[PDB]
Amino acid sequence: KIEEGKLVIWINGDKGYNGLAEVGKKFEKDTGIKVTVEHPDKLEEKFPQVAATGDGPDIIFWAHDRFGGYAQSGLLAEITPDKAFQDKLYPFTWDAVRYNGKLIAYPIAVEALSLIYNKDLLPNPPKTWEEIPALDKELKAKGKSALMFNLQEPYFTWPLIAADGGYAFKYENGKYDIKDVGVDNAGAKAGLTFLVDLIKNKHMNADTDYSIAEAAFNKGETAMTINGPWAWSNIDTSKVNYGVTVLPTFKGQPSKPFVGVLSAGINAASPNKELAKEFLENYLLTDEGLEAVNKDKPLGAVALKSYEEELAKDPRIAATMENAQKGEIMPNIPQMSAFWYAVRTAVINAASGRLKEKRITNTEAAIDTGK
Numbered sequence: 456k457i458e459e460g461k462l463v464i465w466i467n468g469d470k471g472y473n474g475l476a477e478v479g480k481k482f483e484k485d486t487g488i489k490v491t492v493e494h495p496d497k498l499e500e501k502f503p504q505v506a507a508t509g510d511g512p513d514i515i516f517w518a519h520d521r522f523g524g525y526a527q528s529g530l531l532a533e534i535t536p537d538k539a540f541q542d543k544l545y546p547f548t549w550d551a552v553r554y555n556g557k558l559i560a561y562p563i564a565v566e567a568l569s570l571i572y573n574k575d576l577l578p579n580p581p582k583t584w585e586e587i588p589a590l591d592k593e594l595k596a597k598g599k600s601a602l603m604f605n606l607q608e609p610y611f612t613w614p615l616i617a618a619d620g621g622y623a624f625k626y627e628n629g630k631y632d633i634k635d636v637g638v639d640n641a642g643a644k645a646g647l648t649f650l651v652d653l654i655k656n657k658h659m660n661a662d663t664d665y666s667i668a669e670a671a672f673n674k675g676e677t678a679m680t681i682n683g684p685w686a687w688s689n690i691d692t693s694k695v696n697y698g699v700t701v702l703p704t705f706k707g708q709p710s711k712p713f714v715g716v717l718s719a720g721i722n723a724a725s726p727n728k729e730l731a732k733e734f735l736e737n738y739l740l741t742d743e744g745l746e747a748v749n750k751d752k753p754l755g756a757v758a759l760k761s762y763e764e765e766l767a768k769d770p771r772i773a774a775t776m777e778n779a780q781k782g783e784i785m786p787n788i789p790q791m792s793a794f795w796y797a798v799r800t801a802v803i804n805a806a807s808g809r810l811k812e813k814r815i816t817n818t819e820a821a822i823d824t825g826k
């Protein structure tokens with residue numbers, strides 16, 4: 456049961472949940488309506504489990520990719536912003552939360568992964584993945600490492616996997632072919648092999664997760680990490696002298712991070728849909744609401760035109776958009792959970808040296824005269 460006369464909001468533990476609570480406290484002061492913000496573990500799997508039986512939060516925050524599956528399961532109210540409000544957000548962000556012709560969430564901000572580097576350890580960041588092994592050797596002599604990032608979530612490895620030809624679903628003339636998954640082609644496998652080669656040569660560790668990689672970068676132990684805008688505030692606190700830049704190329708080609716649009720859906724079972732609307736349109740999606748969240752954990756490039764223009768001069772945001780442009784927007788189709796399962800299992804299996812993903816490489820006889 457979802458309680459009438461208040462709002463419960465769920466958002467991931469890596470985002471600005473304290474900032475969101477401040478927006479909630481402003482809502483309460485104006486309207487008398489209490490706003491509870493929670494950040495439960497494995498939210499993206501907990502939400503569909505509790506919402507299916509009419510439980511869970513009034514409002515769910517996640518990247519847009521999961522929303523088509525939620526909508527297909529009947530978990531989301533249709534949202535009905537008027538034209539005046541629609542004009543306040545960028546068309547590209549609205550289309551990210553459109554599913555089979557209908558708006559199914561409010562878009563909040565555009566996210567992509569970037570390379571984050573410690574300027575005192577690394578005054579010029581590497582342009583290529585290929586130079587990282589040597590760079591790590593140089594740093595290991597000083598009791599440091601080149602690179603740590605989260606290897607438990609396939610989101611973080613995706614940019615490397617996609618670089619030489621990995622894709623989610625084939626997309627042509629506005630239509631996905633869900634039978635044509637690009638997680639096991641030559642390009643994808645080259646990315647996975649490179650990843651395995653880093654692990655096997657002890658430049659990275661298969662067990663490294665979000666918190667381990669954050670702690671290492673933010674304590675000055677490792678020169679680089681890969682993360683999204685949300686991570687910048689913990690780095691500010693640590694006072695490491697960092698830059699945010701374009702991801703390294705692989706086989707000459709840009710890394711292709713998936714682009715997510717942080718989105719806010721309204722639970723179909725909420726008796727507080729009107730309060731949810733009023734909170735999202737008139738409190739969160741304002742200059743002052745987004746400032747409060749962004750000052751907790753940065754959102755990236757916000758959907759709200761007025762505030763996105765204010766922040767756009769931030770070179771960390773400029774780097775985020777450069778990387779986003781090189782990558783692709785996540786599909787929101789219900790088969791996205793199946794894509795992520797496929798990649799998650801492939802990445803975990805490869806890193807851990809399981810028999811399924813184990814291959815002998817350097818078997819190809821190439822013509823190589825130059826160059």
Ligand SMILES: OC[C@H]1O[C@H](O[C@H]2[C@H](O)[C@@H](O)[C@@H](O)O[C@@H]2CO)[C@H](O)[C@@H](O)[C@@H]1O
Pocket residue numbers: 467469499518520521566608609610611715795
């Ligand atoms: O890993 C958390 C981090 O990445 C997320 O990307 C997700 C994707 O959105 C999910 O649906 C999931 O199944 O796959 C990726 C993780 O492997 C979010 O986009 C991002 O905001 C979040 O903080």
